[PDB]
Amino acid sequence: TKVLVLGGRFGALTAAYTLKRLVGSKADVKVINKSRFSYFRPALPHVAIGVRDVDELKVDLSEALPEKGIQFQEGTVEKIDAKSSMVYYTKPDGSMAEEEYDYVIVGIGAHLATELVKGWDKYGYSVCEPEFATKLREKLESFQGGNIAIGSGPFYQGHNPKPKVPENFVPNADSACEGPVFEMSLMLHGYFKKKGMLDKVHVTVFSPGEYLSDLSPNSRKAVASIYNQLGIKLVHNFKIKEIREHEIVDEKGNTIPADITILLPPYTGNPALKNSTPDLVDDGGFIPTDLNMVSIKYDNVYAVGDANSMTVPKLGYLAVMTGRIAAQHLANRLGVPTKVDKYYPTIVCVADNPYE
Amino acid sequence: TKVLVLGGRFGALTAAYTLKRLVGSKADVKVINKSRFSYFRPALPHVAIGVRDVDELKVDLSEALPEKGIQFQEGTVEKIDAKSSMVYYTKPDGSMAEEEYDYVIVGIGAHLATELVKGWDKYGYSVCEPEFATKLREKLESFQGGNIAIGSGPFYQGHNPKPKVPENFVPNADSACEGPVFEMSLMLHGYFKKKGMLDKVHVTVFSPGEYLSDLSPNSRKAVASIYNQLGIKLVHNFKIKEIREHEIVDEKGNTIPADITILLPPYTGNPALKNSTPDLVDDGGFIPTDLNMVSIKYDNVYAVGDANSMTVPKLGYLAVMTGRIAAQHLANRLGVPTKVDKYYPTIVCVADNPYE
Ligand SMILES: *Cc1cc2c(cc1C)nc1c(=O)[nH]c(=O)nc-1n2C[C@H](O)[C@H](O)[C@H](O)COP(=O)(O)OP(=O)(O)OC[C@H]1O[C@@H](n2cnc3c(N)ncnc32)[C@H](O)[C@@H]1O
Ligand SMILES: *Cc1cc2c(cc1C)nc1c(=O)[nH]c(=O)nc-1n2C[C@H](O)[C@H](O)[C@H](O)COP(=O)(O)OP(=O)(O)OC[C@H]1O[C@@H](n2cnc3c(N)ncnc32)[C@H](O)[C@@H]1O
């Protein structure tokens, strides 16, 4: 039995390791990732005064994986042909390979559509880009004063076909990961407060839809009250279209002053999935599955983490959860009786609570 | 300067210790508590198979306090005369005393109105009573099968006068502490599942109002979906009036089958506060204050924790937060310049998230 695991982070690594440990030699587990190394840092930076806390885990998939009985091949997936059970990918040398599988576990995540933001190239500061968070660190340090805009881009969620899960297990969100925006807004305030710059710095928070939609209206009004107290402005229904040197523009031509723009780019499906068997994916480019992580159309395709339709918000712990379930269910299929954990929707993002 | 601190738990102890450490000899800090000992266990029990995890902190206020420069007097407060700045209390020997204060910090919490529940005496199982949680442990162990009802009583929240705080800082809730209900329902399911009793045991969860009101409607529907998957019934708008041997009755005559009733009693104001200077307290029996924890009517009265109007939900960490703010603000008043922390509403209970 040959099992291909696509990607190299939360969803992929969890599924690979979990699967190999469960079935051992009953299957060949091979991982295909677009890069040799996978990095794991802290979600949000440590904006402290004169104190920079570096902390990253750097995994070499080529050495870390074989060490566990898992083969590794570096390559960029271009599409999956679910009908013939083939994965097409470009190898480092530029050559195009097409390999077949008995089972595939898709963990290549989603896509941060920075390309949908005019001026991102020249003026953007991303919170989700590796060392892009270093460029921000420096700018925030040398900042004399002015306007700061922090927020996220729209979530191009897919809707059809629908995952085969219980009702209300998948929320509809305008933003894929909004919690980090709240936390960062509070941090930026504390940082500038410690520098006696509250009067020189003006923070605006923007949301593609209603801010923190998992909360009740009162809880949302309460968050708005905190912002008001802290001197933070809130702009709802602002779908970013462009970033200029001193302002940001939405889809309707409206503007927000911003000398520094901190953006969580819009989320769209992974291009490789958009270019796969049309009926494997929904209209967003995500793979709808059942509670066992098995595609609703192809019984030998598993989707984990961000790549799966049901993971809303797009959380790393849901990635780990899904990666584990996919591996347990498959193990049972390969003749190794295993308990398959039950999937749960998150209900609410704990970062909504300021005491967190 | 004489500072009386009423009560002996989260709010009181935090304020006393914080105050004494900040002002030292600049003031006499005396604590008056209805008991000599204060116990601190874990919020929710550990219902494991064959594994009972005992873990409690037992504080002897008479020895622990003096050791920190804080005097201690055991007595049950009967009322506070804010006009004359007197605290009336009954001593253990039955005698009545009254001491004048320059400042008072009220940390006597609220009241669990079990008396409002007919049959509580003979058939109730409380989650908030010390060793009452031991009586439940045994019953749940010897349970052969049947119906279990778990939920909370209504919250008799006060509304006027209103705390002097920013808009939306105080939510209106039908339940004072509902999160523990969700967690316990999930635990009970896991416990009976491990005993292969899911078919023999039927759990119903009841709410005085909506069910986790800090969440959006979808998030609430999602929690309802989880219950449906787990075979747990949910009954909204059920304000408990009576407990019989095999069922519970609400205020409208409706019933829920229950051979075991696990209830978080209704919350009402502390009787001693209901019997105090009428204009010190709101219509619920709680003390409305500003963000510094100072009463809106008497500038030398502080309210912390559950006793304060703004603490909704009624959380121990909000008690600690308020206890600390009251102490810092007072210290400044006593000539010891101190930073006064900013109070924040909780926004959402993290227990709403099943992955928590
Ligand atoms: C951006 C962010 C995310 C976040 C967060 C804060 C920020 C700023 N805070 C979080 C938190 O507090 N708690 C939590 O649980 N999650 C939090 N998140 C989200 C987390 O980053 C994501 O949910 C998580 O990373 C999802 O993991 P998944 O494993 O599903 O996906 P991924 O990390 O994007 O990894 C993708 C892997 O696939 C490889 N890849 C991508 N495309 C290809 C192609 N074409 N071919 C081959 N491999 C591919 C990537 O290289 C990567 O290895
Ligand atoms: C019941 C409960 C509470 C709870 C929880 C789960 C359960 C089942 N889980 C929590 C959680 O996960 N996180 C959290 O932060 N809080 C949680 N809670 C709530 C917590 O129990 C309360 O919010 C907290 O106890 C509030 O503390 P506070 O100090 O404000 O009040 P208190 O603990 O009731 O203490 C009252 C003290 O005052 C004395 N007292 C009472 N009446 C008198 C009179 N008349 N005279 C003198 N002293 C009096 C009491 O003896 C006690 O010392």
Coordinates of N, CA and C in Angstrom, one line a residue, chain A residues 145-322:
Chain A
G145 N 5.6 58.4 14.4 CA 4.2 58.7 14.7 C 3.4 58.7 13.4
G146 N 2.1 58.6 13.5 CA 1.2 58.5 12.4 C 0.1 57.5 12.5
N147 N -0.4 57.1 11.3 CA -1.5 56.2 11.3 C -1.1 54.8 11.0
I148 N -1.8 53.8 11.7 CA -1.6 52.4 11.5 C -2.9 51.7 11.2
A149 N -2.9 50.9 10.2 CA -4.1 50.2 9.9 C -3.8 48.7 10.0
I150 N -4.6 48.0 10.8 CA -4.5 46.6 11.0 C -5.8 45.8 10.8
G151 N -5.7 44.8 10.0 CA -6.9 44.0 9.7 C -6.6 42.8 8.8
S152 N -7.7 42.2 8.3 CA -7.6 41.0 7.4 C -8.4 41.2 6.1
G153 N -8.0 40.4 5.1 CA -8.6 40.4 3.8 C -9.8 39.4 3.8
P154 N -10.7 39.5 2.8 CA -11.8 38.6 2.8 C -11.4 37.1 2.7
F155 N -12.3 36.3 3.1 CA -12.1 34.8 3.1 C -13.0 34.3 1.9
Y156 N -12.4 33.8 0.8 CA -13.1 33.3 -0.3 C -13.5 31.9 0.0
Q157 N -14.4 31.7 0.9 CA -14.9 30.4 1.4 C -15.6 29.7 0.3
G158 N -15.5 28.4 0.2 CA -16.2 27.7 -0.8 C -17.6 27.2 -0.2
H159 N -18.6 27.0 -1.1 CA -19.9 26.6 -0.5 C -20.5 25.4 -1.1
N160 N -20.1 25.0 -2.3 CA -20.6 23.8 -3.0 C -19.6 23.0 -3.7
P161 N -19.6 21.7 -3.6 CA -20.5 21.0 -2.7 C -20.2 21.2 -1.3
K162 N -21.2 20.8 -0.4 CA -21.0 20.9 1.0 C -20.4 19.7 1.7
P163 N -19.6 19.9 2.8 CA -19.1 18.8 3.6 C -20.2 17.9 4.1
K164 N -20.0 16.6 4.2 CA -21.0 15.7 4.8 C -20.8 15.6 6.3
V165 N -21.1 16.7 7.0 CA -21.0 16.8 8.5 C -22.2 17.2 9.1
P166 N -22.3 17.1 10.5 CA -23.6 17.5 11.1 C -23.9 19.0 10.8
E167 N -25.2 19.4 10.9 CA -25.6 20.7 10.7 C -24.9 21.7 11.6
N168 N -24.5 22.9 11.1 CA -23.8 23.9 11.9 C -22.4 23.6 12.4
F169 N -21.8 22.6 11.8 CA -20.4 22.2 12.1 C -19.4 23.1 11.4
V170 N -19.8 23.8 10.3 CA -19.0 24.7 9.5 C -19.5 26.1 9.5
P171 N -18.8 27.0 10.1 CA -19.4 28.4 10.0 C -19.1 29.1 8.7
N172 N -19.9 30.1 8.5 CA -19.6 31.0 7.3 C -18.9 32.2 7.9
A173 N -17.7 32.5 7.4 CA -16.9 33.6 7.9 C -16.5 34.5 6.8
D174 N -16.3 35.7 7.1 CA -15.9 36.7 6.1 C -14.4 36.8 6.2
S175 N -13.8 36.3 7.3 CA -12.4 36.3 7.6 C -12.0 34.9 8.1
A176 N -10.9 34.4 7.6 CA -10.5 33.0 8.0 C -9.8 32.9 9.3
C177 N -9.0 33.9 9.7 CA -8.3 34.0 11.0 C -8.3 35.4 11.5
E178 N -9.4 35.8 12.2 CA -9.5 37.2 12.7 C -9.0 37.4 14.1
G179 N -8.9 36.4 15.0 CA -8.4 36.5 16.3 C -7.1 37.2 16.4
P180 N -6.1 36.8 15.6 CA -4.8 37.5 15.7 C -4.9 39.0 15.5
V181 N -5.9 39.5 14.8 CA -6.1 40.9 14.6 C -6.4 41.6 15.9
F182 N -7.3 41.1 16.7 CA -7.6 41.6 18.0 C -6.4 41.7 18.9
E183 N -5.7 40.5 19.1 CA -4.5 40.4 19.9 C -3.4 41.4 19.5
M184 N -3.2 41.6 18.2 CA -2.2 42.5 17.7 C -2.5 44.0 17.9
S185 N -3.8 44.3 17.8 CA -4.3 45.6 18.1 C -4.0 46.0 19.5
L186 N -4.3 45.1 20.4 CA -4.0 45.3 21.9 C -2.5 45.4 22.1
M187 N -1.7 44.6 21.5 CA -0.3 44.6 21.7 C 0.3 45.9 21.2
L188 N -0.1 46.3 20.0 CA 0.4 47.6 19.4 C 0.1 48.8 20.4
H189 N -1.1 48.7 21.0 CA -1.4 49.8 21.9 C -0.5 49.8 23.1
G190 N -0.2 48.7 23.7 CA 0.6 48.5 24.9 C 2.0 48.9 24.5
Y191 N 2.5 48.6 23.3 CA 3.9 49.0 22.9 C 4.0 50.5 22.8
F192 N 3.1 51.1 22.1 CA 3.1 52.6 21.9 C 2.8 53.3 23.2
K193 N 2.1 52.7 24.1 CA 1.8 53.3 25.4 C 3.1 53.4 26.2
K194 N 3.8 52.3 26.2 CA 5.1 52.2 26.9 C 6.1 53.2 26.4
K195 N 5.9 53.7 25.2 CA 6.8 54.6 24.6 C 6.3 56.1 24.6
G196 N 5.2 56.2 25.4 CA 4.5 57.5 25.5 C 4.2 58.1 24.1
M197 N 3.7 57.3 23.2 CA 3.3 57.7 21.9 C 1.8 57.6 21.5
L198 N 1.0 57.3 22.5 CA -0.4 57.2 22.2 C -1.0 58.4 21.5
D199 N -0.5 59.6 21.8 CA -1.0 60.8 21.1 C -0.4 61.0 19.7
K200 N 0.7 60.3 19.5 CA 1.4 60.4 18.2 C 1.0 59.3 17.2
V201 N 0.5 58.2 17.7 CA 0.1 57.1 16.9 C -1.4 56.8 17.0
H202 N -2.0 56.6 15.8 CA -3.4 56.4 15.7 C -3.7 55.0 15.0
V203 N -4.3 54.1 15.7 CA -4.6 52.8 15.2 C -6.1 52.6 14.7
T204 N -6.2 52.1 13.5 CA -7.5 51.7 13.0 C -7.5 50.2 12.7
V205 N -8.6 49.6 13.2 CA -8.7 48.1 12.9 C -9.8 48.0 11.8
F206 N -9.6 47.2 10.8 CA -10.5 47.0 9.7 C -10.9 45.5 9.5
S207 N -12.2 45.3 9.2 CA -12.7 43.9 9.0 C -13.4 43.8 7.7
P208 N -13.2 42.7 7.0 CA -13.9 42.4 5.7 C -15.4 42.3 5.9
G209 N -15.9 42.0 7.1 CA -17.3 41.8 7.4 C -17.6 42.4 8.8
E210 N -18.3 41.6 9.6 CA -18.6 42.1 10.9 C -17.4 41.5 11.7
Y211 N -16.9 42.3 12.6 CA -15.7 41.9 13.4 C -16.0 40.8 14.4
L212 N -15.1 39.8 14.5 CA -15.3 38.7 15.4 C -16.7 38.1 15.4
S213 N -17.2 37.6 14.2 CA -18.5 37.1 14.1 C -19.0 35.9 14.9
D214 N -18.0 35.2 15.6 CA -18.4 34.1 16.4 C -19.1 34.5 17.7
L215 N -19.0 35.8 18.0 CA -19.5 36.4 19.2 C -20.9 37.0 19.1
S216 N -21.6 37.1 20.2 CA -23.0 37.7 20.2 C -22.9 39.2 19.9
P217 N -24.0 39.8 19.7 CA -23.9 41.2 19.4 C -23.4 42.0 20.6
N218 N -23.8 41.7 21.8 CA -23.4 42.4 23.0 C -21.8 42.2 23.1
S219 N -21.4 41.0 22.9 CA -19.9 40.8 23.1 C -19.2 41.5 22.0
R220 N -19.8 41.7 20.9 CA -19.1 42.5 19.8 C -19.2 44.0 20.2
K221 N -20.2 44.4 20.8 CA -20.4 45.8 21.2 C -19.4 46.1 22.3
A222 N -19.2 45.1 23.1 CA -18.2 45.2 24.2 C -16.8 45.4 23.7
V223 N -16.4 44.6 22.7 CA -15.1 44.7 22.0 C -15.0 46.1 21.4
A224 N -16.0 46.6 20.9 CA -16.0 48.0 20.3 C -15.9 49.0 21.4
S225 N -16.4 48.8 22.6 CA -16.2 49.7 23.7 C -14.8 49.7 24.2
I226 N -14.1 48.6 24.2 CA -12.7 48.5 24.6 C -11.9 49.3 23.6
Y227 N -12.2 49.2 22.3 CA -11.5 50.0 21.3 C -11.7 51.4 21.5
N228 N -12.9 51.8 21.8 CA -13.2 53.2 22.0 C -12.4 53.8 23.2
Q229 N -12.4 53.0 24.3 CA -11.6 53.4 25.5 C -10.1 53.6 25.1
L230 N -9.6 52.7 24.3 CA -8.2 52.7 23.9 C -7.8 53.7 22.8
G231 N -8.8 54.3 22.2 CA -8.6 55.2 21.1 C -8.4 54.5 19.8
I232 N -8.9 53.3 19.7 CA -8.7 52.5 18.5 C -10.0 52.6 17.6
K233 N -9.9 53.0 16.4 CA -11.1 53.0 15.5 C -11.3 51.7 14.9
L234 N -12.6 51.4 14.6 CA -13.0 50.1 14.0 C -13.9 50.4 12.7
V235 N -13.5 49.8 11.6 CA -14.2 49.9 10.4 C -14.6 48.6 9.9
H236 N -15.9 48.3 9.9 CA -16.5 47.0 9.4 C -16.7 47.0 7.9
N237 N -17.0 45.8 7.4 CA -17.3 45.7 5.9 C -16.4 46.5 5.0
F238 N -15.1 46.4 5.3 CA -14.0 47.0 4.5 C -13.2 45.9 3.9
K239 N -13.5 45.6 2.6 CA -12.8 44.6 1.9 C -11.6 45.2 1.1
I240 N -10.4 45.1 1.6 CA -9.2 45.7 1.1 C -9.0 45.4 -0.4
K241 N -8.7 46.4 -1.2 CA -8.4 46.3 -2.6 C -7.0 46.8 -3.0
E242 N -6.6 47.8 -2.3 CA -5.3 48.4 -2.5 C -4.6 49.0 -1.3
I243 N -3.3 49.0 -1.4 CA -2.4 49.6 -0.3 C -1.6 50.7 -1.0
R244 N -1.7 52.0 -0.5 CA -0.9 53.0 -1.0 C 0.1 53.4 0.1
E245 N 0.9 54.4 -0.1 CA 1.9 54.7 0.9 C 1.3 55.3 2.2
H246 N 0.2 55.9 2.2 CA -0.4 56.5 3.3 C -1.9 56.2 3.6
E247 N -2.4 55.3 2.9 CA -3.8 54.9 3.1 C -4.1 53.5 2.4
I248 N -5.3 52.9 2.8 CA -5.7 51.7 2.2 C -7.1 52.0 1.6
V249 N -7.4 51.3 0.5 CA -8.7 51.5 -0.2 C -9.4 50.2 -0.3
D250 N -10.8 50.2 -0.1 CA -11.6 49.0 -0.2 C -12.2 48.8 -1.6
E251 N -13.1 47.9 -1.7 CA -13.7 47.5 -3.0 C -14.7 48.6 -3.5
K252 N -15.2 49.5 -2.6 CA -16.1 50.5 -3.0 C -15.5 51.9 -3.1
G253 N -14.2 52.0 -3.0 CA -13.5 53.2 -3.1 C -13.2 54.0 -1.8
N254 N -13.7 53.4 -0.7 CA -13.5 54.0 0.6 C -12.1 53.9 1.1
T255 N -11.6 54.8 1.9 CA -10.2 54.8 2.4 C -10.1 54.9 3.9
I256 N -8.9 54.4 4.4 CA -8.5 54.4 5.8 C -7.1 54.9 5.8
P257 N -6.8 55.9 6.6 CA -5.4 56.4 6.7 C -4.5 55.4 7.3
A258 N -3.3 55.2 6.6 CA -2.4 54.2 7.1 C -1.0 54.4 6.6
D259 N -0.1 54.7 7.5 CA 1.3 54.9 7.2 C 2.0 53.6 7.3
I260 N 1.4 52.7 8.1 CA 1.8 51.3 8.3 C 0.5 50.5 8.1
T261 N 0.6 49.5 7.2 CA -0.5 48.6 7.0 C -0.1 47.2 7.4
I262 N -0.8 46.7 8.5 CA -0.5 45.3 8.9 C -1.7 44.5 8.5
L263 N -1.5 43.6 7.5 CA -2.6 42.8 6.9 C -2.4 41.3 6.9
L264 N -3.5 40.6 7.2 CA -3.5 39.2 7.2 C -4.2 39.0 5.8
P265 N -3.4 38.6 4.8 CA -3.9 38.6 3.4 C -5.2 37.8 3.3
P266 N -5.9 38.0 2.1 CA -7.2 37.3 1.9 C -6.9 35.8 1.8
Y267 N -7.8 34.9 2.2 CA -7.6 33.5 2.0 C -8.4 33.0 0.8
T268 N -7.7 32.2 0.0 CA -8.3 31.5 -1.1 C -7.8 30.1 -1.1
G269 N -8.4 29.2 -1.9 CA -8.0 27.8 -2.0 C -6.6 27.7 -2.6
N270 N -5.9 26.7 -2.3 CA -4.6 26.4 -2.9 C -4.8 26.2 -4.4
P271 N -4.0 26.9 -5.2 CA -4.1 26.9 -6.7 C -4.0 25.4 -7.2
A272 N -3.1 24.6 -6.6 CA -3.0 23.2 -7.0 C -4.3 22.4 -6.9
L273 N -5.1 22.9 -5.9 CA -6.4 22.2 -5.7 C -7.5 22.8 -6.6
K274 N -7.3 24.0 -7.0 CA -8.2 24.7 -7.9 C -8.0 24.0 -9.3
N275 N -6.8 23.6 -9.6 CA -6.5 22.9 -10.8 C -6.6 21.4 -10.8
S276 N -7.2 20.8 -9.8 CA -7.4 19.4 -9.7 C -8.8 19.0 -10.2
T277 N -9.0 17.7 -10.1 CA -10.3 17.1 -10.5 C -11.4 18.0 -10.0
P278 N -12.1 18.7 -10.9 CA -13.2 19.6 -10.5 C -14.1 19.2 -9.4
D279 N -14.5 17.9 -9.4 CA -15.4 17.4 -8.4 C -14.8 16.9 -7.2
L280 N -13.5 17.2 -6.9 CA -12.9 16.8 -5.7 C -13.0 18.0 -4.8
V281 N -13.0 19.2 -5.3 CA -13.0 20.5 -4.6 C -14.3 21.3 -4.7
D282 N -14.6 22.2 -3.8 CA -15.7 23.1 -3.8 C -15.4 24.3 -4.6
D283 N -16.3 25.3 -4.7 CA -16.0 26.5 -5.5 C -15.0 27.4 -4.9
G284 N -14.4 27.1 -3.7 CA -13.4 27.9 -3.1 C -12.0 27.4 -3.4
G285 N -12.0 26.1 -3.6 CA -10.7 25.4 -3.9 C -10.3 24.5 -2.7
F286 N -11.3 24.2 -1.9 CA -11.1 23.4 -0.7 C -11.7 22.0 -0.9
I287 N -11.2 21.0 -0.2 CA -11.8 19.7 -0.4 C -12.9 19.3 0.7
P288 N -14.1 19.2 0.2 CA -15.2 18.8 1.2 C -15.1 17.4 1.5
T289 N -15.2 17.0 2.8 CA -15.1 15.6 3.3 C -16.2 15.3 4.3
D290 N -16.1 14.1 4.9 CA -17.0 13.7 5.9 C -16.2 13.9 7.3
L291 N -16.8 13.4 8.4 CA -16.1 13.5 9.7 C -14.8 12.6 9.8
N292 N -14.6 11.8 8.8 CA -13.4 10.9 8.8 C -12.3 11.5 8.0
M293 N -12.6 12.7 7.4 CA -11.6 13.4 6.5 C -11.5 12.8 5.1
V294 N -12.4 11.9 4.8 CA -12.5 11.3 3.5 C -13.3 12.2 2.5
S295 N -12.8 12.5 1.4 CA -13.5 13.3 0.4 C -14.9 12.7 0.1
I296 N -15.9 13.6 -0.1 CA -17.2 13.1 -0.3 C -17.4 12.4 -1.7
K297 N -16.4 12.6 -2.6 CA -16.5 12.0 -3.9 C -15.5 10.8 -4.2
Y298 N -14.3 10.9 -3.7 CA -13.3 9.9 -3.9 C -12.8 9.3 -2.6
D299 N -13.3 8.1 -2.3 CA -13.0 7.4 -1.0 C -11.5 7.1 -0.6
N300 N -10.6 7.5 -1.5 CA -9.2 7.2 -1.2 C -8.4 8.5 -1.1
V301 N -9.1 9.6 -1.1 CA -8.5 10.9 -0.9 C -9.0 11.5 0.5
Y302 N -8.0 11.9 1.3 CA -8.2 12.5 2.6 C -7.8 13.9 2.5
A303 N -8.5 14.8 3.2 CA -8.1 16.2 3.2 C -7.9 16.6 4.7
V304 N -6.8 17.3 5.1 CA -6.5 17.7 6.4 C -6.1 19.1 6.5
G305 N -6.4 19.8 7.7 CA -6.0 21.1 7.9 C -6.7 22.2 7.0
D306 N -6.0 23.2 6.7 CA -6.5 24.3 5.9 C -7.1 24.0 4.6
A307 N -6.6 22.9 4.0 CA -7.0 22.4 2.7 C -8.5 21.8 2.7
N308 N -8.9 21.4 3.9 CA -10.2 20.8 4.1 C -11.2 22.0 4.3
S309 N -12.4 21.8 3.7 CA -13.5 22.8 3.7 C -14.0 23.2 5.1
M310 N -14.0 22.2 6.0 CA -14.6 22.3 7.3 C -13.8 23.1 8.3
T311 N -12.5 23.3 8.1 CA -11.7 24.0 9.0 C -11.9 25.5 8.9
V312 N -12.9 26.0 9.6 CA -13.2 27.4 9.7 C -13.5 27.7 11.2
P313 N -12.7 28.6 11.8 CA -11.5 29.4 11.3 C -10.4 28.4 10.9
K314 N -9.5 28.9 10.2 CA -8.3 28.1 9.7 C -7.3 28.1 10.8
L315 N -7.4 27.1 11.7 CA -6.6 26.9 12.9 C -5.6 25.7 12.8
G316 N -4.4 25.9 13.3 CA -3.4 24.9 13.4 C -3.8 23.7 14.3
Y317 N -4.6 23.9 15.3 CA -5.0 22.8 16.2 C -6.1 22.0 15.5
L318 N -6.9 22.6 14.6 CA -7.9 21.9 13.9 C -7.1 21.0 12.8
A319 N -6.0 21.6 12.4 CA -5.1 20.9 11.4 C -4.6 19.6 12.1
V320 N -4.1 19.7 13.3 CA -3.6 18.6 14.0 C -4.7 17.6 14.3
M321 N -5.9 18.1 14.7 CA -7.0 17.3 14.9 C -7.4 16.4 13.7
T322 N -7.6 17.1 12.6 CA -7.9 16.5 11.3 C -6.8 15.5 10.8

